[PDB]
Amino acid sequence: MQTQDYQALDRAHHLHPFTDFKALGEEGSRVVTHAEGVYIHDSEGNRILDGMAGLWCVNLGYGRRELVEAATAQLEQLPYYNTFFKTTHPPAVRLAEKLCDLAPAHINRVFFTGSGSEANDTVLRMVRRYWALKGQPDKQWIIGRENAYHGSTLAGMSLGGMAPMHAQGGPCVPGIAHIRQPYWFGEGRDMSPEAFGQTCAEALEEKILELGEEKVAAFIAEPVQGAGGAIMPPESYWPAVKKVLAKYDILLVADEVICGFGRLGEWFGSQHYGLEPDLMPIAKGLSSGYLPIGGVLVGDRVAETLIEEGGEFFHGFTYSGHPTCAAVALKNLELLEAEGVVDRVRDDLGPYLAERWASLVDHPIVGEARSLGLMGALELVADKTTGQRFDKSLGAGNLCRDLCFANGLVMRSVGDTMIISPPLVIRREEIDELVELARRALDETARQLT
Amino acid sequence: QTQDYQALDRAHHLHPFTDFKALGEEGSRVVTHAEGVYIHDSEGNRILDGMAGLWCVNLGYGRRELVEAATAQLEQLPYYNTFFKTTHPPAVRLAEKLCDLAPAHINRVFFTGSGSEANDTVLRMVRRYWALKGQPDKQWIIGRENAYHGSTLAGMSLGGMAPMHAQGGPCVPGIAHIRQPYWFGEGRDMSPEAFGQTCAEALEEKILELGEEKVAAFIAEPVQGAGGAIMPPESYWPAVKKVLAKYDILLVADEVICGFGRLGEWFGSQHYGLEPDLMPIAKGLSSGYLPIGGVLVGDRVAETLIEEGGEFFHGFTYSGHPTCAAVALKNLELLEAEGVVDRVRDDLGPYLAERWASLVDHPIVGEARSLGLMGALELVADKTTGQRFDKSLGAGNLCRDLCFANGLVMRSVGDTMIISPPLVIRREEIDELVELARRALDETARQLT
Numbered sequence: 001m002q003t004q005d006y007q008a009l010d011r012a013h014h015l016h017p018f019t020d021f022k023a024l025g026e027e028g029s030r031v032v033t034h035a036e037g038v039y040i041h042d043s044e045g046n047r048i049l050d051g052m053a054g055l056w057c058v059n060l061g062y063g064r065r066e067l068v069e070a071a072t073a074q075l076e077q078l079p080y081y082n083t084f085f086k087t088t089h090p091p092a093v094r095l096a097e098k099l100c101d102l103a104p105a106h107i108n109r110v111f112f113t114g115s116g117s118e119a120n121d122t123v124l125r126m127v128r129r130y131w132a133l134k135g136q137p138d139k140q141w142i143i144g145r146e147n148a149y150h151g152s153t154l155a156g157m158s159l160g161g162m163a164p165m166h167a168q169g170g171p172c173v174p175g176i177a178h179i180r181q182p183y184w185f186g187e188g189r190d191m192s193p194e195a196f197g198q199t200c201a202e203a204l205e206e207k208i209l210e211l212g213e214e215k216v217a218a219f220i221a222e223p224v225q226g227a228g229g230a231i232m233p234p235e236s237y238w239p240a241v242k243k244v245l246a247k248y249d250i251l252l253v254a255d256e257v258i259c260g261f262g263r264l265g266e267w268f269g270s271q272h273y274g275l276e277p278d279l280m281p282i283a284k285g286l287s288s289g290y291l292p293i294g295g296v297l298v299g300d301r302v303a304e305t306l307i308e309e310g311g312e313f314f315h316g317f318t319y320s321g322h323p324t325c326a327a328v329a330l331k332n333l334e335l336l337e338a339e340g341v342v343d344r345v346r347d348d349l350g351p352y353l354a355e356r357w358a359s360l361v362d363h364p365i366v367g368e369a370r371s372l373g374l375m376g377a378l379e380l381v382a383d384k385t386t387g388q389r390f391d392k393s394l395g396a397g398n399l400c401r402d403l404c405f406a407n408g409l410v411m412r413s414v415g416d417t418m419i420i421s422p423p424l425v426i427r428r429e430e431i432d433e434l435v436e437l438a439r440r441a442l443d444e445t446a447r448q449l450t
Numbered sequence: 451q452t453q454d455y456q457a458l459d460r461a462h463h464l465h466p467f468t469d470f471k472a473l474g475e476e477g478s479r480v481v482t483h484a485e486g487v488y489i490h491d492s493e494g495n496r497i498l499d500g501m502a503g504l505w506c507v508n509l510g511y512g513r514r515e516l517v518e519a520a521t522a523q524l525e526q527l528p529y530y531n532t533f534f535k536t537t538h539p540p541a542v543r544l545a546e547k548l549c550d551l552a553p554a555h556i557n558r559v560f561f562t563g564s565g566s567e568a569n570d571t572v573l574r575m576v577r578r579y580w581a582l583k584g585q586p587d588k589q590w591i592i593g594r595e596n597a598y599h600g601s602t603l604a605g606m607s608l609g610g611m612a613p614m615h616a617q618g619g620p621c622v623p624g625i626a627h628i629r630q631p632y633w634f635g636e637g638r639d640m641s642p643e644a645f646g647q648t649c650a651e652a653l654e655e656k657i658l659e660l661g662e663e664k665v666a667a668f669i670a671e672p673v674q675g676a677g678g679a680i681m682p683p684e685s686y687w688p689a690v691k692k693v694l695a696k697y698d699i700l701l702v703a704d705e706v707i708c709g710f711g712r713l714g715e716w717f718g719s720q721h722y723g724l725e726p727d728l729m730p731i732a733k734g735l736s737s738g739y740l741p742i743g744g745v746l747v748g749d750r751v752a753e754t755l756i757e758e759g760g761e762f763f764h765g766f767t768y769s770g771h772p773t774c775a776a777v778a779l780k781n782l783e784l785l786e787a788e789g790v791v792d793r794v795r796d797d798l799g800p801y802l803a804e805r806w807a808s809l810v811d812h813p814i815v816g817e818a819r820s821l822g823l824m825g826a827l828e829l830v831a832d833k834t835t836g837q838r839f840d841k842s843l844g845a846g847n848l849c850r851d852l853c854f855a856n857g858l859v860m861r862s863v864g865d866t867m868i869i870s871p872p873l874v875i876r877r878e879e880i881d882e883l884v885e886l887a888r889r890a891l892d893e894t895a896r897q898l899t
């Protein structure tokens with residue numbers, strides 16, 4: 001089969017995620033066929049540096065023989081069995097042990113799911129079931145943040161703060177509120193980062209008092225916002241949030257679907273900011289994306305009420321704990337740990353990216369460059385003195401994104417914010433190539449718009 | 451070791467649909483390997499898996515070809531997203547094969563990871579569709595009591611399980627529930643034919659109660675699975691089609707259990723001559739070997755979404771996962787090349803029915819019903835009246851546990867026993883299933899008397 005054959009069949013039969021179906025059918029889908037290391041290859045023979053590690057998830061890179069062998073061995077032994085029938089299997093047991101041993105203190109149980117979205121559905125039912133069992137059935141409201149992403153189920157979309165998602169397929173799940181996001185560059189340059197972080201934390205208290213603490217069940221947040229644009233909050237934000245949560249009896253849900261398993265230099269983003277969440281949804285890097293699996297790490301406070309008071313929890317998925325997916329996730333975690341990959345993002349690749357990434361701040365159209373661990377972002381501006389954006393209709397970010405791909409680099413755009421999330425095993429020479437290709441695309445972007 | 455597995459499992463693993471405390475006290479079963487239609491546990495027991503994992507292992511365990519399909523794709527392209535104006539060969543070929551097997555005018559698929567996520571996709575698609583048609587208040591979805599449509603918030607809301615609705619709500623707004631075509635439990639004051647038409651007429655009443663302008667879709671399993679393997683009277687679906695012909699509402703056929711051979715067709719919709727607008731799928735799509743699901747989308751809905759909708763802000767990281775798709779594709783190729791669906795319809799289905807019917811003369815079996823390789827038995831305390839054992843006696847759970855003790859997985863929904871074995875089960879294995887069931891039925895009857 002030739003590229004156009006794939007494209008024609010794909011156009012005829014395949015509806016892609018988050019896609020303008022009509023536009024893509026007219027321009028023709030890219031066809032990705034194989035990958036190795038940090039590189040992907042398409043049906044036209046192009047080799048591209050995958051600066052997004054698939055979709056924030058291929059932490060150990062492509063071509064890890066050990067993950068292939070883990071799946072093959074489990075498929076030959078027990079490809080599938082359910083965890084419904086008063087049953088478990090060895091992969092589930094061992095993965096839950098390993099996961100909870102890596103989790104922060106007081107987080108000792110896991111409920112398995114297939115995706116980060118199903119994990120957030122699990123979170124929502126667990127949170128509201130929890131308060132019902134506490135004798136407080138009016139404690140129902142969940143506070144998220146604008147521009148947050150918590151998945152694409154109805155619950156995940158409702159918990160998220162994406163207006164274009166909210167505008168499609170609603171009504172949403174009831175009882176979700178949204179406060180402002182700690183995005184200094186886009187929304188806070190009228191203040192010092194420190195003052196802005198405290199304002200955005202105070203917004204949580206304001207929302208609590210607006211709804212009434214007796215009606216609020218939980219606050220949900222990504223430690224660092226991923227899909228919304230790799231937005232690291234000011235250093236003042238999370239300490240001030242902890243101050244607010246200490247005043248009110250509310251659960252903390254840290255959505256670790258992107259930040260988990262090395263991305264920011266820790267096993268969990270919660271650990272980078274010293275949080276103690278009651279629940280933590282996870283997926284993506286859990287298995288380096290090699291097979292689908294997610295879950296909720298459940299803190300002792302929620303777990304004990306559900307166990308001791310709840311009887312049966314009428315919740316779960318056919319593929320919860322899927323033994324082949326669990327076998328792969330277990331091996332992925334063992335490799336991440338045995339090879340010191342997390343320590344290495346934090347002490348080696350993270351700082352190295354930071355210095356190489358910071359060499360882009362002097363580019364004519366880069367208004368800000370930020371990174372943490374192996375997550376990074378650039379802010380494209382038309383005027384550096386004022387920070388003014390290029391006009392929205394010009395699509396500066398999408399143009400830079402397409403020019404990056406044309407130069408051999410996957411670097412995505414959220415509006416006029418460029419983002420990267422490369423595999424955690426990326427080599428220093430490969431980071432060098434990434435920044436060079438980025439600068440080339442930035443050069444070509446600036447020339448075309450001026 | 452078994453007790454070592456159990457202690458670690460108790461400490462850290464919260465199971466689906468489980469009384470966490472009770473199971474921790476009793477000790478989890480530990481399943482460790484499987485081949486053919488049999489599973490094995492950490493104590494060395496071989497058990498005939500009359501439920502095919504969870505209604506999903508259609509080609510049975512030990513299929514070398516599915517293992518090789520997974521290994522080859524993991525070595526080629528283990529994962530890549532379909533978000534970035536991108537696709538990959540497995541998604542392309544799987545979408546082609548799937549739509550070629552689907553009913554007429556069902557030519558597109560949106561991939562998901564699970565049947566639950568597929569029903570979330572259904573719900574957003576249905577409501578986005580009518581919004582694009584200029585009817586944004588045409589939002590109500592009519593499901594059925596005792597329906598099962600998954601365990602997301604959307605799936606739980608779409609389902610009709612009161613114990614689920616009672617945990618973690620509020621539900622998604624705008625879902626109504628009409629009565630189920632369960633003749634044995636709820637219709638024995640009528641002929642099956644009249645009952646089937648009454649249950650169809652309940653749909654019309656609900657439409658008129660809500661107002662056709664507010665109703666978006668009717669969602670139903672062709673045959674209810676988790677609710678107790680409830681085949682409707684033969685009058686039901688023809689009468690439902692008459693109602694659907696009169697009103698402008700979408701039909702969603704939830705094929706997560708009925709898809710891919712279970713009833714003797716590629717889709718339960720095809721057994722009943724339905725023309726659905728959307729069909730969520732999962733489970734048998736891959737014989738459960740790897741997680742994957744999706745929504746088969748009819749031309750009516752697809753063209754509106756494509757031509758009017760712009761971007762659909764919906765999807766999952768693992769939508770179209772190329773390793774899972776590669777396995778699903780091979781599963782379909784094997785099911786077709788080996789004539790498994792045809793064999794359910796013409797051989798194993800009819801054979802189960804005759805052997806299954808040999809259980810009707812048992813002292814506590816009030817009804818035996820089957821279709822393809824789905825079957826159910828109704829436990830009763832008195833065959834004259836059909837009355838149940840008191841719920842407090844747990845007749846169904848006792849029979850379930852006695853089946854397992856005899857080497858057979860046969861599930862209980864209240865006092866309804868259900869089976870859904872792999873589609874590659876052989877005739878003598880169907881005999882063994884019925885023989886082992888009878889042993890458990892004898893022992894249940896003795897223990898309850």
Ligand SMILES: *Cc1c(COP(=O)(O)O)cnc(C)c1O
Binds near residue numbers: 117150152226258768
């Ligand atoms: C990816 C994303 C999700 C959704 O995960 P899926 O596997 O796509 O369902 C949830 N939370 C966050 C923070 C995410 O980035």
Ligand SMILES: *Cc1c(COP(=O)(O)O)cnc(C)c1O
Binds near residue numbers: 563565598676704705
């Ligand atoms: C299994 C089931 C679902 C849910 O599928 P999951 O993969 O468990 O999320 C949906 N619909 C029906 C009819 C089912 O039996």
Ligand SMILES: [Cl-]
Binds near residue numbers: 176177178
């Ligand atoms: Cl509000």
